[PDB]
Amino acid sequence: HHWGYGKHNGPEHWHKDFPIAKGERQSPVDIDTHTAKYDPSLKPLSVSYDQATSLRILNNGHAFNVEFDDSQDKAVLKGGPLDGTYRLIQFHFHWGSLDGQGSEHTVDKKKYAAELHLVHWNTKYGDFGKAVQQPDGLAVLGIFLKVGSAKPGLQKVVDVLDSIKTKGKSADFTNFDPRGLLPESLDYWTYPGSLTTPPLLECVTWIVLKEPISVSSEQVLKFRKLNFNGEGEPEELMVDNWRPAQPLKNRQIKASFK
Numbered sequence: 001h002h003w004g005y006g007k008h009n010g011p012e013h014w015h016k017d018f019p020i021a022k023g024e025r026q027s028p029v030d031i032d033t034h035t036a037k038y039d040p041s042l043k044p045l046s047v048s049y050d051q052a053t054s055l056r057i058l059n060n061g062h063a064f065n066v067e068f069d070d071s072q073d074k075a076v077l078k079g080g081p082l083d084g085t086y087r088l089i090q091f092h093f094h095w096g097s098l099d100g101q102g103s104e105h106t107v108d109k110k111k112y113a114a115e116l117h118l119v120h121w122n123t124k125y126g127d128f129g130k131a132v133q134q135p136d137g138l139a140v141l142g143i144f145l146k147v148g149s150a151k152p153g154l155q156k157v158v159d160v161l162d163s164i165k166t167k168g169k170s171a172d173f174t175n176f177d178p179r180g181l182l183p184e185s186l187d188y189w190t191y192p193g194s195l196t197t198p199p200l201l202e203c204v205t206w207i208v209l210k211e212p213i214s215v216s217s218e219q220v221l222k223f224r225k226l227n228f229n230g231e232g233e234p235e236e237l238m239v240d241n242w243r244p245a246q247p248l249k250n251r252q253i254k255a256s257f258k
């Protein structure tokens with residue numbers, strides 16, 4: 001894998017190594033709020049993060065992941081469009097070089113400064129690697145970030161980024177509560193899609209919250225100080241690590257709210 005987000009290895013190139021990039025249910029997409037339809041049969045979302053056990057934070061050269069113990073049902077996502085139980089394995093963000101870009105999903109073509117992805121896998125498939133090979137293997141909860149007031153629950157993440165500046169660095173990150181990253185409302189849009197990075201597998205039920213969270217300019221500035229490169233390599237700031245919206249094709253986006 002030599003894919004990335006640069007001119008010579010970015011989203012326009014991915015299809016050469018990952019032909020599913022041009023598939024029938026790729027993500028992200030633009031959410032056209034007027035065309036999305038309220039689905040009264042959608043159940044409320046159940047976010048059960050009380051027993052979440054964070055372990056580590058990793059710069060993987062594409063983003064940073066906060067990783068969780070997913071060897072038991074400790075932090076799970078249920079309800080909404082989902083059948084069964086989905087275990088939280090990690091969260092990460094995508095963000096821009098400027099406050100007016102960075103999100104992967106867009107809303108009526110509006111780009112947010114960043115987007116949070118809480119990644120969960122369907123426990124009926126036993127492990128994450130098996131789950132990504134299934135059309136209902138993953139559920140990713142997406143949350144938009146806009147720049148304004150600080151998000152207090154994000155600051156512990158921001159604080160540790162200095163210790164994982166470069167690709168391949170990790171740090172202990174225990175006792176982090178991901179509930180501090182949620183907005184008030186769990187109103188959402190949902191549609192069938194894919195991973196937004198290679199391998200671009202079409203295994204994700206996307207659940208995108210309508211309400212953004214606010215983060216401060218200082219918080220997102222610190223995201224932008226991370227590096228794509230490894231230690232001792234030429235510095236490439238980790239910014240604009242987002243895939244643009246892909247064709248909706250034969251899909252309908254459903255809304256949980258009127």
Ligand SMILES: CCCCNCC(=O)NCCc1ccc(S(N)(=O)=O)cc1
Pocket residue numbers: 117119129130132140194195196197198199
């Ligand atoms: C046998 C195991 C094979 C390893 N398989 C590794 C693998 O496919 N990892 C996928 C990691 C990933 C990528 C993108 C998102 S997003 N941005 O869509 O939320 C979420 C998660």
Ligand code: NA
Pocket residue numbers: 148216217218
């Ligand atoms: Na500010």
Ligand SMILES: [Zn+2]
Pocket residue numbers: 092093094117196
């Ligand atoms: Zn993501």
